[PDB]
Amino acid sequence: GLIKHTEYMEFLKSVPTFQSLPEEILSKLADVLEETHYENGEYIIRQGARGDTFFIISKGTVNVTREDSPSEDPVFLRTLGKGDWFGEKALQGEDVRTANVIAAEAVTCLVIDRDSFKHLIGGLDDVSNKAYEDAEAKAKYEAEAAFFANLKLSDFNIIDTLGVGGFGRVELVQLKSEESKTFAMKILKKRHIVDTRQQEHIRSEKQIMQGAHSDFIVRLYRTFKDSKYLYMLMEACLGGELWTILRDRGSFEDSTTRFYTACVVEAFAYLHSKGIIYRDLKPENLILDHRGYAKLVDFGFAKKIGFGKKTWTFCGTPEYVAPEIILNKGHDISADYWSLGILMYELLTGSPPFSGPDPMKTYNIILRGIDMIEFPKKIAKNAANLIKKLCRDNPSERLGNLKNGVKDIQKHKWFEGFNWEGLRKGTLTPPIIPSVASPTDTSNFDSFPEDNDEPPPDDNSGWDIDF
Ligand SMILES: OC[C@H](O[C@H]1CCCN(Cc2nc3ccccc3[nH]2)[C@H]1c1ccccc1)c1cc(Cl)cc(Cl)c1
Numbered sequence: 001g002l003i004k005h006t007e008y009m010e011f012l013k014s015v016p017t018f019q020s021l022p023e024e025i026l027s028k029l030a031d032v033l034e035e036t037h038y039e040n041g042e043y044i045i046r047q048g049a050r051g052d053t054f055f056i057i058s059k060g061t062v063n064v065t066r067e068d069s070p071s072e073d074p075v076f077l078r079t080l081g082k083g084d085w086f087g088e089k090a091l092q093g094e095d096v097r098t099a100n101v102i103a104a105e106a107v108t109c110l111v112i113d114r115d116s117f118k119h120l121i122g123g124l125d126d127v128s129n130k131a132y133e134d135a136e137a138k139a140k141y142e143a144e145a146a147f148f149a150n151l152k153l154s155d156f157n158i159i160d161t162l163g164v165g166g167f168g169r170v171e172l173v174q175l176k177s178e179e180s181k182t183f184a185m186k187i188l189k190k191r192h193i194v195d196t197r198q199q200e201h202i203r204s205e206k207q208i209m210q211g212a213h214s215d216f217i218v219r220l221y222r223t224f225k226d227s228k229y230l231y232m233l234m235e236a237c238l239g240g241e242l243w244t245i246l247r248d249r250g251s252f253e254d255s256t257t258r259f260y261t262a263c264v265v266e267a268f269a270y271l272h273s274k275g276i277i278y279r280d281l282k283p284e285n286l287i288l289d290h291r292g293y294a295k296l297v298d299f300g301f302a303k304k305i306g307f308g309k310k311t312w313t314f315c316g317t318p319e320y321v322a323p324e325i326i327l328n329k330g331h332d333i334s335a336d337y338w339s340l341g342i343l344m345y346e347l348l349t350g351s352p353p354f355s356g357p358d359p360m361k362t363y364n365i366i367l368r369g370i371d372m373i374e375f376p377k378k379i380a381k382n383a384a385n386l387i388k389k390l391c392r393d394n395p396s397e398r399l400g401n402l403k404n405g406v407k408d409i410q411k412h413k414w415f416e417g418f419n420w421e422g423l424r425k426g427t428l429t430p431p432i433i434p435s436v437a438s439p440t441d442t443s444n445f446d447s448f449p450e451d452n453d454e455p456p457p458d459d460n461s462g463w464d465i466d467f
């Protein structure tokens with residue numbers, strides 16, 4: 001009735017994930033949630049039983065257990081209480097139960113069967129169904145952390161090397177439990193991080209790349225650590241390094257450059273919506289996937305910055321540094337729009353616009369401006385017009401940092417005919433289609449010799465505590 005319905009309504013509002021949901025759904029749940037009771041030691045669920053009902057705990061506690069074999073004692077897993085739940089696989093179709101749920105005292109559950117759950121599912125098209133699908137997406141990422149949190153470096157095999165540098169190297173790893181699942185394992189020498197004073201640069205890289213969920217940014221699942229190296233488990237983008245494709249091809253066509261520039265625009269639009277400056281854009285920071293879709297890979301120089309505030313660190317490759325960084329005036333999200341203009345220019349000509357024989361000479365030609373450079377005939381009138389709008393000296397006057405934000409870059413003449421929606425959907429046909437025969441295919445990468453040198457010194461300082 002009305003009392004019991006409001007009591008279920010007031011209860012669901014106190015449950016961690018169910019409180020964020022619309023009132024429509026909460027009332028529809030409270031109409032069909034049934035109340036079941038159990039005394040101490042009573043089995044709510046038995047392992048191996050076939051079931052169609054989900055349970056939320058309204059009163060008491062239960063003890064979740066599981067036996068891994070017939071002739072092996074049952075293992076204890078956890079103790080759930082008020083607001084917790086269990087049995088949710090039963091709602092998709094999976095009948096067989098994989099763990100025993102025993103009552104620890106007098107327990108009361110609010111229950112819903114698969115049929116009743118499946119029929120409540122079918123509310124308002126984009127009103128009720130909007131926040132539900134977003135709540136189940138938001139929920140999946142804590143479960144992804146839990147999956148990777150149980151693994152160890154010992155659960156992986158090295159397939160082949162993807163990259164090598166002074167930093168360490170990127171190895172293609174294969175999960176032992178699943179031969180179809182491949183990841184890029186970036187292994188970093190800790191003394192190189194300490195020698196370069198990159199402790200916080202990498203501490204922020206972990207925080208940002210794990211927090212990010214863009215199809216235009218390489219995913220970072222988790223990290224590991226030992227006394228010598230930091231290990232970073234990311235997604236495998238087997239399409240190849242953009243800087244090698246650009247090297248092998250020399251330069252890129254207007255249409256080819258457009259697709260890659262657009263992939264960056266979406267990546268930036270995501271980062272900028274969270275107050276994150278990238279600051280490291282250059283062909284080296286881009287990697288294609290097996291479809292030929294580009295993603296940003298290194299977040300070493302990226303920084304989370306509050307809305308309306310500036311940062312003052314002087315870093316980055318001299319050819320991509322914005323004027324406000326050089327001038328020790330502050331800088332924000334708007335420096336990434338400058339980098340987009342520089343990236344466009346190099347992708348179309350094979351060489352960026354500002355370059356001197358050393359950093360200080362390069363910084364002098366950047367300060368003279370984009371208006372002081374003659375654009376080759378190769379660069380199309382529209383591409384050149386966009387590069388000049390993105391490379392304006394004043395960060396306030398810059399395209400992307402004006403009235404409409406990143407939509408002003410998206411809406412530019414150069415982008416007329418560009419299917420922005422098919423790019424976000426993944427249906428737009430890329431310009432360079434890579435040949436990836438399997439998840440273990442590193443043929444789109446350079447050949448790297450095996451590390452024969454001895455390992456670096458230990459580092460047990462403790463700045464790696466979070467890894
Ligand atoms: O699958 C059932 C679905 O799952 C619940 C109960 C089980 C956990 N999950 C969150 C969740 N979704 C995941 C998807 C993938 C991996 C882990 C995940 N955890 C919850 C949730 C909460 C709000 C919106 C969507 C789902 C459910 C949704 C709602 Cl709104 C109401 C009920 Cl009674 C049941």
Ligand SMILES: [Cl-]
Pocket residue numbers: 213214215219
């Ligand atoms: Cl993603």
